Amino acid sequence: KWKTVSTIFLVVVLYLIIGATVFKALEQPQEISQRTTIVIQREKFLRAHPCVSDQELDELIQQIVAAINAGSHWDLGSSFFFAGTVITTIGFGNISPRTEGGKIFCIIYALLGIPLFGFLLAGVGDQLGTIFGKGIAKVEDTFIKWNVSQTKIRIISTIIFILFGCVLFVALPAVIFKHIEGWSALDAIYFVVITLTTIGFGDYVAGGSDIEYLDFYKPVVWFWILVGLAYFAAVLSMIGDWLRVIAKKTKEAVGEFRAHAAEWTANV
């Protein structure tokens, strides 16, 4: 009958405000640092090359920033990657359609492929879940006849799910990404989380740089994208369940606190 939606809306607004403050705190300093150390560069390149005017260099900069949309972008490999970024809704954006017909086809392609890929991803997740059900069935039998509790064997099994999944789907792909892309470890894990959450900023792409790949590589990361999107769907849903549980525990904690203030003053 009632909402409950208003309080979670307010919680989301609060979460966004806290996040915005923290992000500003962590990111504005390096931004102003790079801004002043590039206004150093604009006039240290110009005085080191007197033949460039102060206004012809700006013609150069204007056309280079005009080249923001191009720099092939559209070999069958890169367009296959793009189609993947569309139907997965990752949408890195490093590749994007510029002609109107490309955008119209992109609209149709998204509206049809997102549900179809949803079916594929659901099936992949179900098959992984049954494989993992048998896998937990055996270690839930070795460790099961010792008196250990039953409603905590499930939390030990979630511990094992999280750990094994994050080593197979986050850890070793991250180390491979660092050894192949040249990314840092933190940058690799960042890429993993941002792509498998379907956020997909595009500041890092697993086949973007020119660095020449082993050709065994893009298909394997395709497979990793498929299986990791499923794993991360599971992880995000279980975090949601964590949230609803802690939500009711906090609801009862506020109930208890106000109930201990209630008749604590009836103590007259």
Ligand X SMILES: *CCC(=O)Nc1ccc(C(=O)NCc2ccc(Cl)cc2Cl)cc1
Ligand Y SMILES: CCCCCCCCCCCCC/C=C/[C@@H](O)[C@H](CO)NC(=O)CCCCCCCCCCCCCCC
Site for ligand Y, rule CB under 6 A: 7, 11, 15, 18-19, 104, 107-108, 111-112, 162, 166, 170, 185-186, 189, 235, 239, 242, 246-247, 250-251, 254
| Nearest-5° Cα angle at 121, 115 to 124 | 150
Residue 142 tokens read as 């070795």
CB of 116 to ligand CCCCCCCC, least distance (A): 17
153 binds ligand D10 (CB under 6 A): no
114 belongs to the binding site for ligand D10 (CB under 6 A): no
Q: According to the annotation, is 92 in a ligand binding site?
A: yes
The DSSP output letter for 93 is -
Question: Phi/psi zone of residue 86: left (φ > 0), alpha (ψ -120 to 50 degrees), beta?
Answer: alpha
Dig out the tokens for 63 from the structure: 């056309």
| Closest CB to a second copy among residues 25, 254 | 25
Planar angle of CA 246, 247, 249, nearest 5 degrees? 60
CA 57 to chain centre: 38
Give the residue with the Cβ less far from ligand D10, 227 or 229.
227
Residues 92-131, mask of contacts with ligand D12 (x by CB under 6 A): --------------------x-------------------
Exposure of 202 in the CB half-sphere (CA atoms within 13 A): 12
DSSP alpha helices (H): ranges in 167-217?
A: 172-181, 185-196
165 annotated among ligand-binding-site residues: no
User: Minimum distance between the CB of residue 134 and ligand Y, rounded to whole angstroms?
Assistant: 23
- Give residues in contact with K ion (CB under 5 A): 89, 91, 93, 198, 200, 202
